[PDB]
C-alpha cells in the first residue's frame, strides 16, 4: 500500500506500507528515507496526532492517503 | 562510594577553586558533607541580562553513577526565568536530562548555568508562567526577573514602577513577599493579585 506523509515544507514522501504496520514502523521508515529520529516526528491524520502503538487499519488509512508530519524537537 | 566518582570529584573541585572563572568571582563551589556527594555552588548573574550583580547558590548532589550520569542542580536562591522554576528552584537544561557526557564538569555545569540565565529557552519552560511572559511580554519579564534579582539575590538596583503596586498591596495588610509573588505570577494585574492573596 502506498501513503503519502506531507512536511511543512511541502515536500512529499511517499512510503510503501501495510495497514498491519504500527504508527511507530511508519516513523521507523521516515527514519530510513530521511535520516529524521521517531522520538521528533508528530504524524497527524483527520486532524488528530495518532499514537504510536496503533495501526494505519485502526484509523482507517487507505492507498493513497496523505498524513502530515510535524517535527517536534523532543522538548523535555 | 566508587573511585571513579570520588576521584572525579576530587579533581573538579580543585579545578573550580583554581580556575580563572572563579578567581573573577564568576563560580565558586564548597563541601557540604565529608563524603562530597553534596555541594554548594554559587554563581554570579551574568553581565547585560536581569540578573546582573545577583549572586545565585546552587544545591548540588552527586550520583553514584558519577561522571557517567548528572549531578542533581536545583537553585537555592530564587529566581524569574523560564527554565527554573520560580516555586522550587528546579532546572530545565538537556545537559541535566538527556545530554550529559562523561567529560562534563562540575565547572562546565556552573558555566552552562551561566550561560543559561543569559539565553533562555521559553518554548522548553520549566515555568510555564514565567515563559508565558517571557515571549507575551519582554520588558515586563525583564523588570520582573531584575526585581526578583534584587529582592532575592543581593542585585543593587530594581524598578521604581513596580515599587508603587507592591506598597498598594502591601498597605491592604499582605505580607511583601507574598505581595511580591502574586503580582509577578499575575503580571502586574493588581485585580487578580488581590484575588490571589485574598483566597
Given amino acids: 500500500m502506498q501513503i503519502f506523509v506531507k512536511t511543512l515544507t511541502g515536500k512529499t514522501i511517499t512510503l510503501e506500507v501495510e495497514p498491519s504496520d504500527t504508527i511507530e514502523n511508519v516513523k521507523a521508515k521516515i527514519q530510513d528515507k530521511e535520516g529524521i529520529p521517531p522520538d521528533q516526528q508528530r504524524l497527524i491524520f483527520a486532524g488528530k496526532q495518532l499514537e504510536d502503538g496503533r495501526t494505519l487499519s485502526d484509523y482507517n488509512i487507505q492507498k493513497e492517503s496523505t498524513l502530515h508530519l510535524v517535527l517536534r524537537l523532543r522538548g523535555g | 562510594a566508587a573511585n571513579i566518582a570520588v576521584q572525579r570529584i576530587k579533581r573538579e573541585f580543585k579545578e573550580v577553586l583554581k580556575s580563572e572563572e572563579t578567581s573573577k568571582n564568576q563560580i565558586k563551589v564548597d563541601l557540604v558533607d565529608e563524603n562530597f556527594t553534596e555541594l554548594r555552588g554559587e554563581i554570579a548573574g551574568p553581565p547585560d541580562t536581569p540578573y546582573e550583580g545577583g549572586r545565585y547558590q546552587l544545591e548540588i548532589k552527586i550520583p553514584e553513577t558519577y561522571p557517567f550520569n548528572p549531578p542533581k542542580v536545583r537553585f537555592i536562591t530564587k529566581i524569574w526565568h523560564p527554565n527554573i522554576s520560580s516555586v522550587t528552584g528546579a532546572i530545565k537544561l538537556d545537559i541535566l536530562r538527556d545530554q550529559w557526557a562523561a567529560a562534563m564538569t562540575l565547572r562546565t555545569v556552573l558555566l552552562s548555568l551561566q550561560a543559561l540565565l543569559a539565553a533562555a529557552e521559553p518554548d522548553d ?60 505570577s499575575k503580571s502586574w494585574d493588581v485585580e487578580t493579585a488581590t484575588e490571589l492573596l485574598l483566597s
Fill in chain 2, 125 to 184: 519552560p520549566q515555568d510555564a508562567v514565567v515563559a508565558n511572559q517571557y515571549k507575551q511580554n519582554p520588558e515586563m519579564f525583564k523588570q520582573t526577573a531584575r526585581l526578583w534579582a534584587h529582592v532575592y539575590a543581593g542585585a543593587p538596583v530594581s524598578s521604581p514602577e513596580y515599587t508603587k503596586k507592591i506598597e498598594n498591596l502591601s498597605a491592604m495588610g499582605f505580607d511583601r513577599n507574598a505581595v511580591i509573588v502574586a503580582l509577578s
